[PDB]
Structure formats: structure tokens, C-alpha cells
Amino acid sequence: MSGPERITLAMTGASGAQYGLRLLDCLVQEEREVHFLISKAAQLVMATETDVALPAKPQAMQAFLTEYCGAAAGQIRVFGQNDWMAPPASGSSAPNAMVICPCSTGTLSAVATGACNNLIERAADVALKERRPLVLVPREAPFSSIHLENMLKLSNLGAVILPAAPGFYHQPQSVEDLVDFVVARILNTLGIPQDMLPRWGEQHLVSD
Amino acid sequence: MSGPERITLAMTGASGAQYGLRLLDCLVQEEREVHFLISKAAQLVMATETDVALPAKPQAMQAFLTEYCGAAAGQIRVFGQNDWMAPPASGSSAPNAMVICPCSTGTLSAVATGACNNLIERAADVALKERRPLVLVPREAPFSSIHLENMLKLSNLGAVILPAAPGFYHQPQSVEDLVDFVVARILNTLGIPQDMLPRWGEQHLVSD
Amino acid sequence: MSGPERITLAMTGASGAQYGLRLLDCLVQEEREVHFLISKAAQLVMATETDVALPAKPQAMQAFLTEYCGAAAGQIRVFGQNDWMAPPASGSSAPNAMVICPCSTGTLSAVATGACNNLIERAADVALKERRPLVLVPREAPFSSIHLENMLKLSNLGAVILPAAPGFYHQPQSVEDLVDFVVARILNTLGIPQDMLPRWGEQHLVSD
Amino acid sequence: MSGPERITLAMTGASGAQYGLRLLDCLVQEEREVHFLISKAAQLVMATETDVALPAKPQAMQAFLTEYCGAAAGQIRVFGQNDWMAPPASGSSAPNAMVICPCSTGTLSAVATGACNNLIERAADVALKERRPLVLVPREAPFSSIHLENMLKLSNLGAVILPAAPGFYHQPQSVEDLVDFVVARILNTLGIPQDMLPRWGEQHLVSD
Amino acid sequence: MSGPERITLAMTGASGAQYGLRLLDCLVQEEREVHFLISKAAQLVMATETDVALPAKPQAMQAFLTEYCGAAAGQIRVFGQNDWMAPPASGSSAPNAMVICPCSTGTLSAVATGACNNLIERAADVALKERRPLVLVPREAPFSSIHLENMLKLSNLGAVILPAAPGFYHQPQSVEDLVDFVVARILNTLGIPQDMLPRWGEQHLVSD
Amino acid sequence: MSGPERITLAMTGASGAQYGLRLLDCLVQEEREVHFLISKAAQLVMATETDVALPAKPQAMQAFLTEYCGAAAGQIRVFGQNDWMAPPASGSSAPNAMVICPCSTGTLSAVATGACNNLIERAADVALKERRPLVLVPREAPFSSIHLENMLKLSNLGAVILPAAPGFYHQPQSVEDLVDFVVARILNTLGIPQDMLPRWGEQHLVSD
Amino acid sequence: MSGPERITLAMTGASGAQYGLRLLDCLVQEEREVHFLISKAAQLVMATETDVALPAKPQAMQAFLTEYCGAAAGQIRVFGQNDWMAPPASGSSAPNAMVICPCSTGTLSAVATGACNNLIERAADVALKERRPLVLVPREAPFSSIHLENMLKLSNLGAVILPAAPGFYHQPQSVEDLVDFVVARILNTLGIPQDMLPRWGEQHLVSD
Amino acid sequence: MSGPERITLAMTGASGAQYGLRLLDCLVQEEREVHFLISKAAQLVMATETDVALPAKPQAMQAFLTEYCGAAAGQIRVFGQNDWMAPPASGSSAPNAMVICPCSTGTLSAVATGACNNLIERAADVALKERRPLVLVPREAPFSSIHLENMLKLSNLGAVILPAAPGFYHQPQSVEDLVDFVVARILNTLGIPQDMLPRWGEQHLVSD
Ligand SMILES: Cc1cc2c(cc1C)N(C[C@H](O)[C@H](O)[C@H](O)COP(=O)(O)O)c1[nH]c(=O)[nH]c(=O)c1N2
Ligand SMILES: Cc1cc2c(cc1C)N(C[C@H](O)[C@H](O)[C@H](O)COP(=O)(O)O)c1[nH]c(=O)[nH]c(=O)c1N2
Ligand SMILES: Cc1cc2c(cc1C)N(C[C@H](O)[C@H](O)[C@H](O)COP(=O)(O)O)c1[nH]c(=O)[nH]c(=O)c1N2
Ligand SMILES: Cc1cc2c(cc1C)N(C[C@H](O)[C@H](O)[C@H](O)COP(=O)(O)O)c1[nH]c(=O)[nH]c(=O)c1N2
Ligand SMILES: Cc1cc2c(cc1C)N(C[C@H](O)[C@H](O)[C@H](O)COP(=O)(O)O)c1[nH]c(=O)[nH]c(=O)c1N2
Ligand SMILES: Cc1cc2c(cc1C)N(C[C@H](O)[C@H](O)[C@H](O)COP(=O)(O)O)c1[nH]c(=O)[nH]c(=O)c1N2
Ligand SMILES: Cc1cc2c(cc1C)N(C[C@H](O)[C@H](O)[C@H](O)COP(=O)(O)O)c1[nH]c(=O)[nH]c(=O)c1N2
Ligand SMILES: Cc1cc2c(cc1C)N(C[C@H](O)[C@H](O)[C@H](O)COP(=O)(O)O)c1[nH]c(=O)[nH]c(=O)c1N2
Ligand SMILES: C=C(C)CCOP(=O)(O)O
Ligand SMILES: C=C(C)CCOP(=O)(O)O
Ligand SMILES: C=C(C)CCOP(=O)(O)O
Ligand SMILES: C=C(C)CCOP(=O)(O)O
Ligand SMILES: C=C(C)CCOP(=O)(O)O
Ligand SMILES: C=C(C)CCOP(=O)(O)O
Ligand SMILES: C=C(C)CCOP(=O)(O)O
Ligand SMILES: C=C(C)CCOP(=O)(O)O
Ligand code: NA
Ligand code: NA
Ligand code: NA
Ligand code: NA
Ligand code: NA
Ligand code: NA
Ligand code: NA
Ligand code: NA
């Protein structure tokens, strides 16, 4: 297969729960193993922005997401926010790619400073020190200079700063089209196949 | 009235022509004078992403936009890309607020470095030197460190970096809902009334 | 009225005494209260460059300037260089806008470093810490990197660096026309009405 | 195969047209797809430094280069300098490696600042934001601090700064030997096979 | 003779066309060879601010300026904005001093970043890399932090930042006196004789 | 002659009055014009460290130094600390080289920040902005980071930081030998002939 | 004569021994005194890249180079790598210009940090502190950020970074043509006459 | 006793061997243990500047210095330049204060960058990492920006930069007086008693 076999998918409390759920769905359909983490604030965002009734405890949450996505047994692992025995907490784990989608300004800050206050933040700190893929999907407007300096620091260190800023150049007709645009960009960055966003200009041979 | 009487609205070649056209519409409905500028690349974006048939020359363009928006005579001024006799080119002009929406990465770069290669870039340079409002609405993903350093420089100098990253926390049901979210943020930043985005928590008195 | 009711006008020892005297005159004609400060070197510049016989002590100086400008009783206050009991010395004073015109390279340096060695320098330090308007009008050529770093530091902190560099785009016919150009820019920056410099392109509707 | 299937080859107006043409030839012989871009200044350099009569319009240019290189149908794509519908203009395109050879100091500047003023500059901006290979081949002497700061910024962000500085340690006997040295380094950097430059010390087992 | 035999004089689109024309006149009267460059925006400034009817094409322009200045045959060379075959485009040319007067904020930006988008910008880039004299005469007010950072960068690299800020300490009586002050400073910086501005204090022996 | 015709020699309140007096003597013997400045603190240093009874007022001081050095009429000019009519105060003066010897840490600070609080400091500020030679001779130990940052800033801008640190590699036999070493270095830096310090290795042809 | 009478020519272990030998030859033909230094690694490069059999000890080396170049008695001085009694080791020596050609990345590093570990490195440190000409000719590709930061530091301090990157704009026909291009640039930078590279555009009067 | 019991005294190849020998003498007379290190270049300096015939090998050198100073058995330890078994090479050694006197610009560079190429450089690196006293006594003039940046870095990290710049404010009468001034400053910095330099103003009670 192309792209990583395992993805750590962390959802934090920025707006855009639909992006994270659609990415999870696409990763499952590409037969990838997903290590799923979600912050307390992100659980409130999901309840506010969607009709998904996500259980609060990791195990109930794991069973729910497995059925919601049509995932195989053990394909989605759910780890709690202080579970340091989980693979993402150590660089000696098997290599994963990591995506934080959505990525709150608070999680952006924690990763930029190295706070490691929970498993999501420690997992990102591990990704950076092992030079494993780390994609951050912030959703915020305006961006202050605090936000921008944190994103610049992380981009300089190899993280992919991929804001939830969908493009319109394929004439989106629905909210789902715009959600899929951003998810397609994430999958492209990871090297995972997707057919939601065409390859721009692939049939374009010489200028008109 | 609240907010600026005159707004320089510049559209450049990032995806998201719908944002600029909706902002223009809202500014006209709030009885504001608009000094409208558009780059050659933005004209191609508009043709690609919308069914608006925008004429190419400023005068024909001015007549078209006046009818498209239901604007009054003289409410929308259109200036060409080398028209240094237009108000936005000099700081001795009457004060305007300026918005670049969408703002391409190329225009972001030009404003950050001071290139002043056309009227849009010179108008932004004037806004910064006179400390008049300047709002940039980039649409790009991922943001590279070049993009982020340019945005950070401008934010440090007082520009508002407002990416086209709509929020979902009012459960958008259409593309128009997401476009309106971003336009509402721009209007809020300018201090211009809008009723597309409620005032968060305004009815919330004490914690639950 | 538009713009500040009170302006601290400090003259320091750069060439261009005519700029400061013309600004004083315009501020008086706009019925503004002026807190007038002048350095010892600026008194020598004024004697060298003009026929104004300015008395040396604040009180005699106050009487002279009141008559020279046709100002009302108490409209021009003059404070000596060590008069820490004057309003500009403390941030608890009533808010003023401050202009240093001309601004010597030495006063530019003192303000950039925070030297507070006299009332002019302390008044500028107060303006910066209270985020009240501060406009500096340097007159120097070439600018060395020392000058430029000091101006850059202050501009980054919100000061308006407005060099005595008159424009020619209204075809000046006299020295007074060029002096008035710079004074008009200062008044524009403060938000005080002026009719010496037209609003560029105000009658320009669409490109030719 | 080893190395990228597709290479965006941009020629800009530095001296050394022979380097770009030889690289194009080698890429074609390694059965790679080439997206070929050339600036107006580079067309003048090619006319000055070679006897290649390169047609000016992309289509005529494409036919000429296909025959000049012995390339297959569709193996060389030529795109004009404002053809935003071409693959290199968007990060959603199929992944390419990009080489700017020769890279003028002006194109070096544009890429370092993010100017995106034409397809070459936008294509490099896309390469950087998608973290796809970007190789710059400047030809300039002396390098000023402006040149060096631009190269340092880009190298820090992952671009390969590969100056047109051929080595002599295999005793070159002709201009072609020196051209081939630089082209071999570019191919090595891309991971594309080449037999013009041996693998240094490959037969060297222990010190003498 | 004292000072450079050849001067590249570039006029760009800042206000102050009189400064450039007076400098040209003085350079011709000092029997210097002048390589004259002018931007499209500067041609509009000259038409707005003066009654000089400058022809648009280099050759007609060369004939006009030769007669306007009373210059000798071949003393004034005029080169077009894309004439890379002109001496200023290469560091292998005979050494010139270079002055950009007036220097727009856009040309200041281009030189600071190394844009080399036209012959003026490339000529300044060459001056810096060969460590040949480069004098920039900006005319702008206020200076923003973008302007100041660009001027500081160039001054740090050896360029002379000489703003069009005339002094009053010889009691100017006309616009021409103020124009001549700035031109005299430029000539002093180049080491070229001038008798418009006396040598300050030359007759002053001991303090009074 | 070789080297500058005129030297501004400023003595400030660091230890080492003998260095300044010996430099003055050597400059007079090389038939150079000297513009002599001395701070109040330096006058106290001279009284503490030498038996020279230097008069306090510039004119009496000028007569004394002329006789002390055997100088010609008008060869030594003395200017007071606030004499802005003296040549060193303006860049429009005839070009001088400037030496501050000894240079106190306070004068080092003032020059680095641009304080221009007296004629010595303004003269150094002028030297830097006109890119005329400026040599600083500090005498201090230890150097703090404040001292070092000020020296580094000035050295980066072209000033010569020449500490009063005599060498021993010609086997000095007296205090005068060590004083002469430092003075010889200053004269070498200015390009003025001296025979106190031989040209190292001038007779050395090939290694032993 | 034009240019320096004495040149310190240091060869270090970068590829391109032909550049250094050709420069030596040209300096001898222009009747210049050359203080010749060569590193141990450069001696190996010369043996690898040329058929010159250079003796290892300075004296034998001096005799060989004198005959190889047709130099006069004493025109070429050779100094060993620890000969601190040689002129280049002290700033009290007679002024030389210095060229390091080729300049290895290791010598570039040593000069940038001030290592002074041998006579070449100490001689460059002396050139920088005395503000005497220093030209570095690196030969390396790619340049890493370590290389670029070292070159940028030195260029900021006045060193000329002149990479061995020959131009093709006079249609070179042999390796010797390309070697001569770089040597001509070095001689131009030093101000020493050369007829290998014409003065670009010297006969070009007005644009075509 | 006051001050450190053990001092690592390193002499490197700057001029001023008399300073190091006098410091050694004073340390021995204060009954301190001295770990003595000397570079190869410093041995040449000592032979050039003094009549001390210092043996080359550590053991012979130790016997010589013990007699030269009148030191006790074992009071002076001499360690060779690669003797990593000596105490100064490790931070686990008993705490010493360290002085490099004289400190060449090359040793200043090595300590600033952390080169650790010999025992002197490693000993200074150890002093810095253990936060044990480190005093550097450079002797150089002019100081270049390379020298100044290295001194600034080390001073920021706690090293004492004490240049060999003797003061004259006690009217020195001999070379020995000036040598003793610098040595007294070193001893003062270490907290070791000395009676060569009085305590300034100790008898001064109130101002005159
Ligand atoms: C409904 C809703 C919507 C948003 C938020 C919250 C809630 C409840 N928050 C604020 C964010 O959750 C808060 O700062 C948390 O502290 C983030 O914590 P975590 O990073 O998720 O642990 C939030 N934060 C952000 O960066 N971007 C956003 O768009 C939003 N929107
Ligand atoms: C249809 C389409 C879509 C896009 C673009 C182009 C086109 C034709 N471009 C590229 C951009 O237009 C190009 O870099 C121009 O050089 C920008 O020039 P202006 O800043 O508009 O003058 C673009 N640029 C950007 O920053 N964000 C975007 O989302 C897009 N998308
Ligand atoms: C006639 C005349 C003209 C000038 C000056 C002086 C005099 C007497 N000075 C020098 C300046 O006054 C001096 O550096 C003072 O130290 C400035 O002190 P204040 O900042 O006014 O206290 C001066 N300074 C400056 O920055 N720009 C200028 O154009 C001039 N011109
Ligand atoms: C014959 C010839 C030779 C050269 C050039 C030009 C010409 C015509 N130019 C100058 C360069 O082309 C100019 O600055 C252009 O503006 C570069 O534009 P592009 O980057 O190609 O769009 C150039 N530029 C550079 O960086 N290195 C070089 O060696 C040369 N040599
Ligand atoms: C009449 C007039 C007057 C001015 C200008 C224009 C015109 C037409 N412009 C704007 C400037 O010309 C514009 O930003 C151009 O893009 C500069 O391009 P060049 O640098 O000349 O190629 C301008 N720019 C500037 O930096 N200072 C100024 O004083 C003025 N004034
Ligand atoms: C006898 C004597 C000796 C010294 C000093 C003073 C006196 C009276 N001062 C202190 C210095 O003079 C003081 O900080 C002044 O404020 C410097 O002012 P000027 O820079 O001369 O105006 C002093 N300053 C310094 O930097 N190096 C020194 O060696 C000395 N030594
Ligand atoms: C044949 C050959 C060729 C090269 C080298 C070596 C040899 C033997 N080296 C490596 C370089 O010599 C090495 O890093 C030395 O340590 C440089 O020491 P000096 O700076 O000469 O003392 C080298 N170094 C470099 O910077 N550029 C180059 O092109 C080469 N090429
Ligand atoms: C007689 C004599 C005099 C001096 C020197 C040398 C010699 C032989 N050197 C140069 C210095 O010794 C050289 O750069 C060495 O490489 C320094 O190596 P160490 O730091 O001692 O290992 C030297 N270096 C320095 O920084 N200041 C100085 O005053 C002198 N003077
Ligand atoms: C073992 C755990 C939980 C963290 C340690 O992982 P490492 O830092 O990568 O060695
Ligand atoms: C007059 C025009 C077109 C630009 C000058 O405006 P300013 O720079 O604000 O003085
Ligand atoms: C009261 C005086 C003179 C200064 C104190 O003012 P503040 O610093 O703003 O509290
Ligand atoms: C579609 C075009 C031409 C540019 C947009 O590409 P992206 O910035 O990578 O989303
Ligand atoms: C030859 C032209 C037009 C530019 C090349 O000049 P150089 O960069 O100085 O070698
Ligand atoms: C005229 C005096 C005293 C200072 C002004 O000199 P300038 O700053 O160089 O124009
Ligand atoms: C004397 C030698 C070998 C070096 C000292 O030279 P200086 O540093 O320039 O005083
Ligand atoms: C033991 C030796 C020679 C060096 C190790 O010392 P440390 O670095 O301080 O642990
Ligand atoms: Na914690
Ligand atoms: Na421009
Ligand atoms: Na004070
Ligand atoms: Na652009
Ligand atoms: Na360009
Ligand atoms: Na002052
Ligand atoms: Na060393
Ligand atoms: Na080592």
C-alpha cells in the first residue's frame, strides 16, 4: 500500500468536527489502522456541531466508532488522555503518522512549546522528535501573531500546517464537498489514496 | 453609522471568489462606498468558480457590479491595476478601510515585502503606513513557512490576518452558510453591522 | 470636533523650524490646546533658520507665541525642559497627542532607548506607555543604520515616523507650499482638519 | 524506477542554458515526464549562449523540444508563464520534483519571498508548501548578502541550493565535462540514475 | 577628476521628479557619463509634476535629454527597462556609481529583496554584489515599518539611504533651493564637486 | 599625501590621556589639520594622569595645544562641546576622518545608540551616516556584555574598534613604547605614515 | 598602477586548483607581489587535478613557482602554514589584498568563526580586522545551510564571496575559457587589469 | 583563604607573555595551586617577547617554572596539550578557576564555538558547563566583529572578558607597572588578594 499503515488521529476542540469524522471514515475505508484520541473540549464541539452521540469512555467510544465507520475488529484503537501505556506516547512505538484535526489554538500552542500535558500533546512531541509525519489542521479566524508564531515554529521543524480552509476551484455544491476538500488535502499530504479531489491539470498537455 | 464609510475591496487570485462577491454585496447593503480592485488572476478565478460574467475593463466592470449588487450610482468605484490617480494609491486620500478577499499567497508576499507593483499592493502599503485598517483573507493549505512568516510580519504590524476558514459551530447547512460565516467575521473586524452570525453567548448569564 | 483636543508639540534641534511653527499656527487655528516644548538646540536652529525672535524663558516664550499665533489666553502652554509638574510628564495626565517636529536624531535616539533625560523625552516615553499618539518628524540625510534602527523600533511600537520629506505631486510653487505639505500630513495623521493638501483622487470615479 | 516519475524543469535567466538543456536531455533518456517552463529572460539567455533556435510559443516550443531530445509523444509538456491550469500551479496535482536550472537571482528572490508572480514562481511555492523536492541552481558571482540570505532561507526550509559550480576532481577535458558534472549532481540529488559522474571512492576499501 | 566617471541614474515612481532632473543636469555639467534609466511610473510622475515632455522610447528619450541638458554626444546613454545587454545589468561592466532618485517604496522593496524584475532593479543588485556605490533617494511619509526594515537592510549592506528631506539651515528662498540641497548631498556622497551647498563651518576656527 | 588631510580627534573620559596627546603630536608632525574636541571628564582624566595643564576654554586651549605640539597657526582647531557651528556637526562639512581616543564606555554607548548629546557624539553620528572613517579607542577591563554589544553594533556598521591594548612583540622598554604601539595602529588604520611600528615580516621572504 | 601592489593568495582544499594557478599566473604578469600560501589538502587536490608537481617545502615550492610563472626574483613569496613571522600574520604588516582560491568549506568555516588555526586562517582574520580586501572562492554543491550561514556572515562583514561559478554568456569553448572567467572576476574585484573578460555592454549606447 | 585554591592558567599565542608570567608569579606567592597549560604558539611568543628559556616538554617545563617562581614542590602542575587524564579535562575534577592569559583570537574562537581541540580548549569548555570561573585576557587591535561576537557570546554565558588594556590612572612609570595593572584586575576578578592596585576611592568619604 501507499502511505502509512497506522495513523494517530487526534481531535481537539476547534470547530470542524465534521473534518475529523470524515477523515476517520476515509482512513478506515483505506484499510488503515487508526489510533484515535479526542480531547474533552473536542467532545463538546462534536455534540454542538453534529448529531453523533459519541460515548465518553474510551472503550464504549471504541465500540461506537467501529460500528459508525464500518471498521474491522481492532482497526480503530481508542486511547484515553492520560494513557501513557499507549503506543503514541513513546518513540519506541511502531511508526505512525499523526494528524490533529481539528487542531485548537490551545493544542497548537502546547505542541509548539512542548507542553506534553496529555496523550495528544505527548504524541505530537514524539512525532516531532522521531521526525514522523505530523499534520495540524487549525480552524481559527483571525489568526493572531501568537497563533502565527506557533504555526511558523512547527512548520520550520517539519510539521505540516494545513488549515481548514477549503478551496472552491471545483465548484463545491454542499458542505460535504468543502469538508471533503480539506480531508483530501490531508490524505494527499500523508500519501494515502483519495478520489474526492482530482489531480489538478493532469490532462493538461500544453498551454492554450 | 458604525464602521468605516469607505472600504477598499481588493480581490486577488486565491480560491474563494464567492467570499469577495458576498462581502461586496453586504457592504453595498450597509450603504458603504466601495473602491473595488481586482487582479488579472482573480478574474480567472471568478470565471472558474462562479457563473458571474465580469467585464474586463474597469468602466464596464463598474456598470456590471452596480447592477449585480443593486448599488446606487457612484457607490461602487472600480479602479484599474495601474491607476495611480485613484484614492487608494496615496495616504493623502480620504481614509478607507481595506480588505483583500481572497488574498493570494502572491499578494500576501507583495504586501509583506512592500512590492507596490500594482494598485492593490500600493493601496495595502498605504494602509499600513497610515495605520488604516487592513484585513487579509488568505485561502491556502498547507501554509508553508514562507506564507506563515509573511502573515506573521503583517500581523505584527497591525494587519488582520483572517483566513478563509469558516466555523461550523452554528451547524451550517449550505455552502452559502460557510461563505457567510467568513464574511460576517470580516464585517465584525471592520465594525460594520451584520446579522448572519449571532453574537456568541449574548444570552448566556451564568454557567450551567 | 475631530482629532485630539490637546497636542503636545515638541520642537527639537533638527533643521526645519518652519515646519514646527507652521504646525503650531495650524493647531491654534483649529482651536486646539497646545502644550509647547522646545529644546536648547532647537532654539538655536530657530534663530539660524528664521527671523522669529523667540524669548528663552517659558513665560516670556508663552506670551510671545500667544501673540505670534493669535492664540487665545491659555491656549498655548509652555513648559520648561525639567518641569516634571507639567501634564506631559505623567500618564495620569489628561490624554494628549504628541508631535516632535522637527525631531533631531538625538531625540529620536533618546525616545527609542527610553532615556527620559528631559521633559520632551519623558513626554514621548509616556505617550508610548499609555499608547497615546506619538508622531516623530525627523530631518536628516543620509539616514544611517543607527537612525533607521531607532525609527524601526519606534514604528514597531506604534509611533508614526513621518520624515520631513515633502511631496511634489501638487506642483509646489514656494517653500511655504512644501512646508505646508508636511504639516498637512501631520494633521491628517492626527485626524485634525486641514485644507492645504487635497484628498487625493476624491473626484476620481473609474479608471480612464 | 528510482527517483521521481515527473520533474518540473524551469529555466530562468541566469547564465548556463547548457545546464538546463543537458538536464532535460538526461531526464528524457531516463524516461521521465518533464513539465517544462522557461522565462522570457531565459529565452534571451538561450539565444545568446547557444545555437538552439527555441520557438517562443509553448506549443511550437513543445514540438521543438520533443524532436531536439528524441522524446516520446507527451513526455515533455510545455506550459506558459501564466497557465494556472497547469499541474505545477496547485498542490493537488500529482507529485513532481522541481528543478530551477539555471536559477536567476531574481527567481531566487521571488521563491524566497513567495512572490508567485508567474507559473515558475508559483510552482516553487507549491513545492515548498507540499514538501516536494525543490532544487535551485543559481549562477552568480560574487554572491551578495541579499543572494546569500535568500539561499539560506530556502535551504532552511528544505530546498536544495545547488550552485552551478562544477568540480574538477575527475580532470575535465571539455566544457561538456563541466556541464555534465553539475547535471550529474542534480540527478544524484533527485535520486535519478546517471553515469556521467562516478561514485567517489566506491572501490576504496581501506586507507593507503 | 574627483568621483566616479560614470553614474547610473535611475528614476522611479516616487514624487520628486525635479530632484532627478536637477541631478542629471549637475552630472552633465561635471562632464560625467550618465547611464539613464526610468520606470513607467516615473514617466507618469514626471508628466504630473513638471512641464518636461519626455519621449517614451529610449532613443527619442536620449535625444531629448541630450538637448535638454546641453550634454555632449554619447554623454547620456538611455537604456530600456528590459535591456539586459546594457552595462548596468552585469558586474563585468565598467564600474559605475548608481543613484536611484527618486526611489519609490516599490523599488526600495525590490532592491532589498533582490527581485531584479527590470534593469533598474538588476542594476542595483549588481551594484550591491560588486560593492559599487548605490544611493537610494526615497520620498515617502510616513515611513512604515516595511519601508524602514527595507532601508535598514540595505544600509547595513553598504547602500546610502538618502531621503529627499532638504535642510533649511542656509535659509532657502525657493523650491529650487530645496531641490538643490538634496542634489548637493547626493553629489557629496558620490565625491563629485558641487557649489550649491557650502562646506559647513569651513571658516570656523575656534568656538565663540 | 597619504591618508586624510583633516582628522577630528575627540578625547573622552577613559583612562589613557597619553594616547590622545601622542596621537595629536603625531598628526601635527604629519602636517594634518586636527579638529580637537575634549569632554569634561577627559579634562579631569588628563589632570589626573599627566602634568599637562590644559586650559578649560576652547580658545585658551587652542593656543596651549598649538604651542605644546609645535603646530602651525590654524593647524589645530578646538571646538566646544555644544558648538554646532563647527564642521564636525554636519555631513555637509569637508570630509574628515574621526578618532575618539580614549573612548569612554559612556561615549561608546552614546555613539552606538545615536544619542548626539554633544559635539563629540554628533560628530561620530555624522561620520557613520556619511560613511567617513570612525576609529574608537576604548580603555576598559573587564568588558561587560553591554560594552561588547555596543562595540559589535558599531563594528558591523563600519567603525574601527581599536582598544588600547598595546602589543609586546617588539620588546617594549618603556611606557612610551606601549603608548606609541597603540598610536601607530591608529595611524596605520587611517593610512597616515608612521615609523614607530615596523611593517611586520616585510624582510621575510620564505619560511625558515 | 591600479589595484593592490601585494596579494596574499591562499589555496585551500576545494576542487579547482586550476583557478588558483591561473590567478597566480595573471597576478605575476601584472607585476604584483604575491604572498603564496597553500594547505596540505590543497596540495593533494593539485596532485589529483593537475600535472603540476609542486614541491612540498616552502623554499623548494618558491623556486618551482617562480620558474613555473616566469616570475621575477622575490616576486612570489611562499610561507609555511605555521610561519607567524610572515607578513600576513599581523595587521602591522604592509597592506595586502587577500584571495582564498579555491576556498574549502573548512576554510570558509574557520574564517567565519575566527579559528586562526594556521597562517591562511590567521591571515584572513587579519584582513577582516584591518578592513583589507578579502575574497573567498568556494567550490561546493549543494551548499548546505552551514555553508550559507558562514558565507552570509562574512559577506555582511565585507568579505567578497565569489563562488567558482563561471558564466557562459561569452560562449566558452574550452575548460580554460571557464577558468579564465572566474579569474577575471577575481581580478575585477581587486581592481587589477585583465583582458580575458570584456566589459559588458561597453559599446552599447541606447536600447534596440 | 580568599579566592580559589586552584587556578588553571593557560597561556595562548597572543602577545603579552609578560602578563601570564607575572600572573603565575603572583598566584604562586599567594600559595595557590596552579595547573599550567601553554600552547605551541604561546611558546613562540614567549621566546620572541622575553628572555625566559622555557623548556618544551611538560616535565622539564614544570621543573623550570617551579624554580623560576620559587614555587613549592607540586604547587605548579604542567599538563600537555593532549593530556586528557589531567584534572582540567573533566568536570568531575576538583573545582578550579580558569584564566587564559594571554588569550589569542584563535583560542577565543575555539572557546566560543566549543571546539575542544586541545586541553586548553576542553578545559574552558568544562569551566563553562560546570559554571566555574573562566577569565579570558585577549590582546588584539582592532577587534573585528568576529572577535566581538565571540567575546559577547562568552560574556553572556558568564565568562569574564578582561582585555589586556592597562589603565593609567595611577601614573604608571614602567612597563612593569602596566603589566601589574592587568594582573591585579585578574586577581581582583578571582577574589585573590593583591597589593599592586589600590582600592579606588577607599579613603574618599564625601564629595569635594
Ligand atoms: C463549540 C466550541 C467551538 C469552539 C471552541 C470550543 C467550543 C466548545 N474552541 C475553544 C477550544 O475548545 C478551547 O480553547 C479548549 O481549551 C481547547 O482545548 P483542547 O485543545 O481541545 O484540549 C475553539 N478553539 C479554536 O481554536 N478554534 C475554534 O474554532 C473553536 N471553536
Ligand atoms: C482557478 C485558480 C485557483 C487558484 C489560483 C489560480 C487560479 C487560476 N491560485 C494561484 C494564483 O492566482 C497565482 O499565484 C497568481 O499569481 C496570484 O496573482 P494575484 O495575487 O492575484 O495578482 C491560488 N493562489 C492562492 O494563494 N490560493 C488559491 O487557493 C489559489 N487557487
Ligand atoms: C543650525 C543647526 C542645524 C542642525 C542641527 C543643529 C543646528 C544648530 N542639528 C544637530 C542637533 O541640533 C544636535 O545633535 C542636538 O544635540 C540635538 O539636541 P536636541 O535633540 O534638540 O535636544 C541637526 N540634527 C538633526 O538631527 N538634523 C538636522 O537637520 C540638524 N541640523
Ligand atoms: C545574456 C544574459 C545573461 C545573464 C542575465 C541576463 C541575460 C540576458 N542575467 C539577468 C537576468 O536574466 C535578469 O535579472 C532577469 O530579470 C531574470 O528574470 P527571470 O528570473 O528569468 O524571470 C543573469 N542573472 C543571474 O542571476 N545570473 C546570470 O548569470 C545572469 N546572466
Ligand atoms: C503622481 C504620482 C506620485 C506618486 C506615486 C505615483 C504617481 C503616479 N507613487 C506610487 C508609485 O509610483 C507606485 O507604487 C509604482 O508602483 C512605483 O513603481 P516603480 O518603482 O517606479 O517601478 C509614489 N511612490 C512613492 O514611493 N512615493 C511617492 O511620493 C509617490 N508618489
Ligand atoms: C581619572 C578617571 C579615570 C577613568 C574615568 C574617569 C576618571 C575621572 N572613567 C569614567 C568616565 O570618565 C565617566 O564614565 C564619564 O561619564 C565619561 O564621560 P565622557 O564620555 O568623557 O563624556 C573611565 N571610563 C572608561 O570607560 N574607562 C576608563 O578607564 C575610565 N577611567
Ligand atoms: C581531491 C579532493 C577534492 C576535494 C576535497 C579534497 C580532495 C582531496 N575537498 C575536501 C577538503 O580538502 C577537506 O575538507 C579539507 O579538510 C580542507 O582543508 P583545508 O581547508 O584545505 O585546510 C573539497 N572541499 C570543498 O570544500 N570543496 C571541494 O570541491 C572539495 N573537493
Ligand atoms: C610573536 C607572535 C605574536 C602574536 C601572534 C603570534 C606570534 C608568533 N599571534 C598569532 C597567534 O599566535 C596565532 O593565531 C595562533 O594560531 C594562536 O594559536 P593558539 O591559540 O595559541 O593555540 C597573535 N594572536 C592574537 O590573537 N594576538 C596577538 O597579539 C598575537 N601576536
Ligand atoms: C515509554 C514512554 C511512555 C515514553 C518514553 O518514550 P521515549 O521518550 O521515546 O523513550
Ligand atoms: C500621490 C500618489 C499617487 C502617491 C503619493 O502618496 P503619499 O505617499 O501618501 O504622499
Ligand atoms: C507624576 C509624574 C511627574 C510621573 C509619574 O507618572 P506615571 O509614570 O505615569 O505614574
Ligand atoms: C488550483 C490552483 C491553480 C491553485 C490552488 O492550488 P492549492 O493551493 O494547492 O489548493
Ligand atoms: C551578462 C549579464 C547581462 C548578467 C551577468 O552578469 P554577472 O552576474 O555579473 O556575471
Ligand atoms: C548643519 C548642522 C549643524 C547639522 C546638519 O547637518 P546634516 O545632518 O548633515 O544635513
Ligand atoms: C605579530 C604577529 C605575528 C600577530 C600580531 O599582529 P596584530 O594582531 O595585528 O597586532
Ligand atoms: C573524563 C574526561 C577526561 C572527560 C569527561 O568529563 P565530563 O564531561 O565532565 O563527565
Ligand atoms: Na505538564
Ligand atoms: Na515594482
Ligand atoms: Na537620565
Ligand atoms: Na504578484
Ligand atoms: Na522576476
Ligand atoms: Na539629547
Ligand atoms: Na587554534
Ligand atoms: Na576537534
Numbering used by the authors:
A (entry chain A), B (entry chain A), C (entry chain A), D (entry chain A), E (entry chain A), F (entry chain A), ...: 1 to 208
Authors' text:
Originally thought to be redundant but distinct decarboxylases, it has been shown that UbiD is in fact the only decarboxylase, whereas UbiX produces a cofactor strictly required for UbiD activity. The UbiX enzyme catalyses both the N5–C1′ and C6–C3′ bond formation to generate the fourth ring of the prFMN product.
To further investigate the N5-prenylation step, we determined the reactivity of PaUbiX with a series of monophosphorylated compounds resembling DMAP. Interestingly, even the DMAP isomer, isopentenyl monophosphate (IMP), is unable to initiate any flavin alkylation reaction. We determined the PaUbiX:FMNH2:IMP ternary complex crystal structure, resembling the catalytically active PaUbiX:FMNH2:DMAP complex. This reveals IMP is indeed bound in a nearly identical manner to DMAP, located directly above the FMNH2 isoalloxazine plane. FMN reduction is also accompanied by a minor decrease in the distance between FMN N1 and a water molecule. Crucially, no formation of an N5–C1′ bond can be observed, a process that occurs rapidly upon reduction of PaUbiX:FMN:DMAP crystals. Thus, a dimethylallyl moiety is essential for reactivity, as neither saturated DMAP-like compounds nor the isomer IMP lead to N5 alkylation or prFMN formation. The lack of activity with all but DMAP(P) substrate (or GMP) confirms the first step is an SN1-type prenyltransferase reaction dependent on formation of a dimethylallyl-derived resonance-stabilised carbocation.
